Amino acid sequence: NCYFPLQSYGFQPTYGVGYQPYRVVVLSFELLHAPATVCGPKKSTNLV
Amino acid sequence: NIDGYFKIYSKHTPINLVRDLPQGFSALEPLVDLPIGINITRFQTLLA
Ligand SMILES: *[C@@H]1O[C@H](CO)[C@@H](O)[C@H](O)[C@H]1NC(C)=O
After folding, report:
1. How far apart are alpha carbons B4 and A39 in whole angstroms?
2. Helix or strand holding residue B48 (H, E)
3. What residues contact residue B29 under an 8 Å CB cut-off, 6+ apart?
């Protein structure tokens, strides 16, 4: 009942629709306590 | 340091004087603004 706590993944090109490897990104952000150093792009138009 | 933004304004001007801070007048232009957020309580320079 001792267990080494990790278990390495197995990813072969033969596996079914579940076992296979999927990459993840989480755009985590912690919000609204400080001055801004990022926003999205501020699109613009021709000068009449 | 204003509401989480640091600001530098500066000048360089030519002189000919021996001793004291030259009597006369010029303004400083704003050079750079940075959103650093830190508490500047105190400071030091850097010699070479
Ligand atoms: C600056 O000081 C205030 C007052 O203690 C504090 O609320 C704030 O978190 C401080 N910020 C830093 C980066 O020291």
Report:
1. 16
2. none
3. B9, B10, B11
Residues 1-20 of B with CB under 8 A from A: 3-5
For B39, the token pair is: 């508490």
Distance from CA of A40 to the nearest CA of B (A): 17
Query: Half-sphere exposure of B12 toward its Cβ, with a 13 Å CA cutoff?
Result: 1
Cα A15 vs. chain centroid, distance in angstroms? Answer: 23
> Residues with Cβ within 6 A of ligand 1?
B 37-39
- The token pair at B9 is 């304004």
| Method used experimentally | cryo-EM
This PDB structure is determined at a resolution in Å of: 3.8
User: And the tokens for A20?
Assistant: 């296979």
